[PDB]
Structures are given as structure tokens and as C-alpha cells.
Design a protein around this ligand. Structure first.
Ligand SMILES: *[C@H]1O[C@H](CO)[C@H](O)[C@H](O)[C@H]1NC(C)=O
Ligand SMILES: *[C@H]1O[C@H](CO)[C@H](O)[C@H](O)[C@H]1NC(C)=O
Ligand SMILES: *[C@H]1O[C@H](CO)[C@H](O)[C@H](O)[C@H]1NC(C)=O
Ligand SMILES: *[C@H]1O[C@H](CO)[C@H](O)[C@H](O)[C@H]1NC(C)=O
Length: 9
């Protein structure tokens, strides 16, 4: 399913 990525600090 639609996954999401996190923005690196
Ligand atoms: C969400 O994470 C999955 C993990 O395999 C995929 O990398 C997918 O391309 C990601 N979706 C987006 C929009 O970056
Ligand atoms: C990607 O972002 C979505 C936004 O709702 C969620 O926070 C999800 O948990 C995130 N995925 C990761 C691996 O942090
Ligand atoms: C998560 O990382 C992916 C990797 O290309 C994309 O840069 C995406 O825009 C990122 N998501 C957020 C919320 O920064
Ligand atoms: C986005 O933040 C999450 C929160 O733990 C993870 O560290 C993930 O590895 C980060 N993504 C990037 C591209 O640094």
C-alpha cells in the first residue's frame, strides 16, 4: 500500500 518516507533531520 501507499508508503511514506521520512525527511532526514
Ligand atoms: C514508500 O516506501 C516504500 C518502501 O519500499 C517504497 O520505497 C515507496 O516507493 C515509498 N513511497 C514513496 C511515495 O516514497
Ligand atoms: C510516512 O509518513 C506518513 C505520514 O502520515 C506516516 O507518518 C508514516 O508512518 C511515515 N512512514 C515512516 C516509515 O516514517
Ligand atoms: C521521504 O524520502 C523520499 C526519498 O526520495 C522523498 O524525498 C520524500 O519526499 C520524503 N518525504 C518527506 C515527507 O520528506
Ligand atoms: C526519516 O526519519 C525516520 C525516523 O526514524 C528514519 O530515521 C528514516 O531513516 C529517515 N529517512 C531518511 C531518508 O533519513
Amino acid at each position: 500500500p501507499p508508503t511514506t518516507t521520512t525527511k532526514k533531520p
